[PDB]
Design a protein around this ligand. Structure first.
Ligand SMILES: Cn1c(=O)c(O)c(O)c2ccccc21
Length: 274
C-alpha cells in the first residue's frame, strides 16, 4: 500500500477540487485519476459506515459507486498526515464538457440532447443513492470520447440528500438558484433542476446565461444562438423563478424536446467521430 500500487503521470488539473494526476494501477495497467486534497482546505467532513473521519466527498462517492458508468467511481482512497488521496476511474481518451464547448462552440441540438439526457440519468442515480452533487456544470462532466458516455465528477461541494431546507452552499455561484442568492435557502431537487437549466442553455448557446446576481434574480433568458422553441421552453421551465414551478426529473425527461435520444455509441460515431 501507499505509492507502490500506482505510477504517477502528468498533472491533469488543479483548483477547488484539489490536484488531480493521471495514473496507472500497476497491478493491471488500469487507467486512474489520483486526486490529492489538503486536510486544511476541507470544510465538510463525514463518517463512513465503518466509523472513520473522512471528507464528505469520500462518503458521497462510496454511496454512488456501482456498475452504472454515469458517475465516476472511487476505487480506493488513502490518508496521509496532511491530505487524503482518492483513486478514481479515468476514461481514455477524455475531455471535460467545458473544454469541449470551448473548442467546438454551441452544440447541435441532437448532441446536446444526448449529453443532457445522460447528465439527467447520472443526477437521478445520485439522488436515488441519497446524494446531492450541488455543483453540476460543464467543468464537472467528463466525456468518454470513444464511447460517447458522460461521467459526473467532483462531489466535493455535495451533501447527503434531504427533504428539508439547505442553508449552506459552496458550489458555483453562476449555477446557483435565485432563492440561494436572495434568501440563502434552497431545497435539493429544485436547485439541481435550476443548475440543469443553466447547463442546458450552456450546451446550446456555448455559454452560461447569467454572470451577475441581478441577472439570476431577474431570471430573464435571452437566446444568442438559434435554438428550437421546444428547447427554449424546457430551459425556461428549468429556470423558473419559483422553485415549485420547475419541472421534476420525470417532467424534464418526458418533455417533447427530450424524445428520441441517441444512444451514447451512436452519439460518438456521429458527433465525436469514433
Ligand atoms: C476523476 N477525475 C476528477 O475527479 C477530476 O477532478 C478531474 O479533473 C479529472 C480529469 C480527468 C479524468 C478524471 C478526473
Amino acid at each position: 500500500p501507499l505509492e507502490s500500487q500506482y505510477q504517477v503521470g502528468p498533472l491533469l488539473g488543479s483548483g477547488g477540487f484539489g490536484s488531480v494526476y493521471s495514473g496507472i494501477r500497476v497491478s493491471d495497467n488500469l487507467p486512474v485519476a489520483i486526486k490529492h486534497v489538503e486536510k486544511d482546505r476541507i470544510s465538510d467532513w463525514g463518517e463512513l459506515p465503518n466509523g472513520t473521519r473522512v471528507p464528505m466527498e469520500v462518503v458521497l462517492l462510496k454511496k454512488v459507486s456501482s456498475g452504472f458508468s454515469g458517475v465516476i467511481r472511487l476505487l480506493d482512497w488513502f490518508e496521509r498526515p496532511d491530505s487524503f488521496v482518492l483513486i478514481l476511474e479515468r476514461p481514455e481518451p477524455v475531455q471535460d464538457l467545458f473544454d469541449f464547448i470551448t473548442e467546438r462552440g454551441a452544440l447541435q441540438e441532437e448532441l446536446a440532447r444526448s449529453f443532457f439526457w445522460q447528465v439527467l440519468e447520472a443526477v437521478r442515480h445520485c439522488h436515488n443513492c441519497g446524494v446531492l452533487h450541488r455543483d453540476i456544470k460543464d467543468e464537472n462532466i467528463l466525456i468518454d470520447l470513444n464511447r460517447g458516455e458522460l461521467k459526473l465528477i467532483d462531489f466535493g461541494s455535495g451533501a447527503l440528500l434531504k427533504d428539508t431546507v439547505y442553508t449552506d452552499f459552496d458550489g458555483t455561484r453562476v449555477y446557483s438558484p435565485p432563492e440561494w442568492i436572495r434568501y440563502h435557502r434552497y431545497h435539493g431537487r429544485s436547485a439541481a433542476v435550476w443548475s440543469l437549466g443553466i447547463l442546458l442553455y450552456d450546451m446550446v448557446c456555448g455559454d452560461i446565461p447569467f454572470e451577475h446576481d441581478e441577472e439570476i434574480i431577474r431570471g430573464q433568458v435571452f437566446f444568442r444562438q438559434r435554438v428550437s422553441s421546444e428547447c427554449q421552453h424546457l430551459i425556461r421551465w428549468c429556470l423558473a423563478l419559483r422553485p415549485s414551478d420547475r419541472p421534476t426529473f420525470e417532467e424534464i425527461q418526458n418533455h417533447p424536446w427530450m424524445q428520441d435520444v441517441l444512444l451514447p455509441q451512436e452519439t460518438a460515431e456521429i458527433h465525436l467521430h469514433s
